[PDB]
PDB file of C-alpha atoms in Angstrom:
ATOM      1  CA  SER S   1       0.000   0.000   0.000  1.00 41.22           C
ATOM      2  CA  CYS S   2       2.904   2.323  -0.789  1.00 38.85           C
ATOM      3  CA  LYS S   3       1.081   4.291  -3.485  1.00 39.45           C
ATOM      4  CA  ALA S   4      -0.248   7.832  -3.887  1.00 39.33           C
ATOM      5  CA  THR S   5      -1.991  10.305  -6.192  1.00 44.22           C
ATOM      6  CA  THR S   6       0.023   9.604  -9.341  1.00 45.30           C
ATOM      7  CA  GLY S   7       0.543  12.461 -11.777  1.00 44.75           C
ATOM      8  CA  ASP S   8       3.529  14.413 -10.476  1.00 44.44           C
ATOM      9  CA  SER S   9       6.872  13.105 -11.734  1.00 43.01           C
ATOM     10  CA  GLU S  10       7.806  10.943 -14.721  1.00 43.81           C
ATOM     11  CA  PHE S  11      10.625   8.987 -13.078  1.00 43.59           C
ATOM     12  CA  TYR S  12      11.624  10.655  -9.809  1.00 47.48           C
ATOM     13  CA  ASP S  13       9.596   9.390  -6.849  1.00 47.75           C
ATOM     14  CA  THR S  14       8.841  12.793  -5.324  1.00 47.74           C
ATOM     15  CA  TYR S  15       5.091  12.225  -5.064  1.00 49.05           C
ATOM     16  CA  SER S  16       5.892   9.926  -2.140  1.00 48.72           C
ATOM     17  CA  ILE S  17       8.103  12.510  -0.438  1.00 49.56           C
ATOM     18  CA  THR S  18       5.568  15.293  -0.986  1.00 51.76           C
ATOM     19  CA  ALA S  19       3.495  13.590   1.708  1.00 51.30           C
ATOM     20  CA  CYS S  20       6.441  13.155   4.074  1.00 52.58           C
ATOM     21  CA  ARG S  21       7.245  16.865   4.292  1.00 52.75           C
ATOM     22  CA  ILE S  22       3.576  17.399   5.140  1.00 51.87           C
ATOM     23  CA  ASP S  23       3.449  15.052   8.129  1.00 50.81           C
ATOM     24  CA  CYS S  24       6.964  16.228   8.980  1.00 48.13           C
ATOM     25  CA  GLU S  25       5.843  19.796   9.671  1.00 50.11           C
ATOM     26  CA  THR S  26       2.605  18.687  11.331  1.00 47.60           C
ATOM     27  CA  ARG S  27       4.709  17.187  14.122  1.00 48.27           C
ATOM     28  CA  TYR S  28       7.186  20.070  14.231  1.00 49.26           C
ATOM     29  CA  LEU S  29       4.424  22.649  14.671  1.00 53.12           C
ATOM     30  CA  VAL S  30       2.276  20.659  17.097  1.00 52.21           C
ATOM     31  CA  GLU S  31       5.499  19.971  18.994  1.00 53.17           C
ATOM     32  CA  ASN S  32       6.170  23.511  20.211  1.00 53.28           C
ATOM     33  CA  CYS S  33       3.447  25.555  18.514  1.00 54.17           C
ATOM     34  CA  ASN S  34       0.972  22.842  19.509  1.00 56.25           C
ATOM     35  CA  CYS S  35      -1.198  24.059  16.633  1.00 55.35           C
ATOM     36  CA  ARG S  36      -1.961  22.903  13.091  1.00 54.15           C
ATOM     37  CA  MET S  37      -2.100  24.981   9.907  1.00 57.06           C
ATOM     38  CA  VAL S  38      -5.088  25.931   7.752  1.00 53.28           C
ATOM     39  CA  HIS S  39      -3.970  23.408   5.135  1.00 50.33           C
ATOM     40  CA  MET S  40      -3.443  20.726   7.782  1.00 52.00           C
ATOM     41  CA  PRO S  41      -6.189  18.069   7.997  1.00 54.09           C
ATOM     42  CA  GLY S  42      -8.572  17.650  10.917  1.00 55.09           C
ATOM     43  CA  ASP S  43      -6.493  16.745  13.963  1.00 52.25           C
ATOM     44  CA  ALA S  44      -5.253  19.457  16.322  1.00 51.48           C
ATOM     45  CA  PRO S  45      -7.393  22.321  17.690  1.00 52.60           C
ATOM     46  CA  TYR S  46      -7.422  25.339  15.377  1.00 56.55           C
ATOM     47  CA  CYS S  47      -5.671  28.199  17.170  1.00 52.77           C
ATOM     48  CA  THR S  48      -6.347  31.914  16.714  1.00 57.82           C
ATOM     49  CA  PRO S  49      -4.949  33.613  13.583  1.00 56.91           C
ATOM     50  CA  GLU S  50      -3.029  36.239  15.553  1.00 55.26           C
ATOM     51  CA  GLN S  51      -1.028  33.499  17.273  1.00 54.83           C
ATOM     52  CA  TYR S  52      -1.188  31.074  14.348  1.00 50.55           C
ATOM     53  CA  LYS S  53       0.619  33.455  11.997  1.00 53.21           C
ATOM     54  CA  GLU S  54       2.805  34.842  14.783  1.00 52.85           C
ATOM     55  CA  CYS S  55       3.909  31.319  15.701  1.00 54.69           C
ATOM     56  CA  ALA S  56       3.972  29.944  12.156  1.00 52.44           C
ATOM     57  CA  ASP S  57       6.321  32.713  11.022  1.00 53.55           C
ATOM     58  CA  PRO S  58       9.176  31.668  13.347  1.00 54.98           C
ATOM     59  CA  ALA S  59       8.089  28.024  13.312  1.00 53.63           C
ATOM     60  CA  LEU S  60       8.790  27.575   9.599  1.00 54.14           C
ATOM     61  CA  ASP S  61      11.698  30.028   9.559  1.00 52.16           C
ATOM     62  CA  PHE S  62      13.156  27.893  12.350  1.00 54.40           C
ATOM     63  CA  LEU S  63      12.586  24.379  11.010  1.00 54.14           C
ATOM     64  CA  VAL S  64      13.584  25.617   7.554  1.00 55.31           C
ATOM     65  CA  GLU S  65      16.992  26.638   8.897  1.00 52.84           C
ATOM     66  CA  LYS S  66      17.595  23.894  11.463  1.00 51.55           C
ATOM     67  CA  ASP S  67      15.233  21.136  10.333  1.00 53.38           C
ATOM     68  CA  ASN S  68      16.700  21.102   6.823  1.00 50.97           C
ATOM     69  CA  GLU S  69      17.793  17.472   6.512  1.00 48.59           C
ATOM     70  CA  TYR S  70      15.787  16.140   9.456  1.00 46.57           C
ATOM     71  CA  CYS S  71      12.728  16.702   7.266  1.00 50.90           C
ATOM     72  CA  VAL S  72      14.116  14.366   4.603  1.00 53.17           C
ATOM     73  CA  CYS S  73      12.229  11.344   3.271  1.00 54.56           C
ATOM     74  CA  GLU S  74      13.194   8.237   1.300  1.00 55.62           C
ATOM     75  CA  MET S  75      11.687   6.947  -1.947  1.00 55.42           C
ATOM     76  CA  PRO S  76       8.484   4.854  -1.847  1.00 53.17           C
ATOM     77  CA  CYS S  77       8.404   1.063  -1.559  1.00 52.46           C
ATOM     78  CA  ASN S  78      10.060  -0.536  -4.589  1.00 53.47           C
TER      79      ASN S  78
END
């Protein structure tokens, strides 16, 4: 069951990683920010916008600098 919504790459298996980065941030945000994003699926309690954007700003700018490789994923099942 290592499939996904085909229709992204011709050879490269990025479609599989595209999902990793998603769940990767979901844990990074909920970790300290303890809040999900507007694009994030139903899970954590939606926090106010004032704090959501105020926390998301540094959250991403932080994980993007530090969590550069940590947010790496491997190709799908072959």
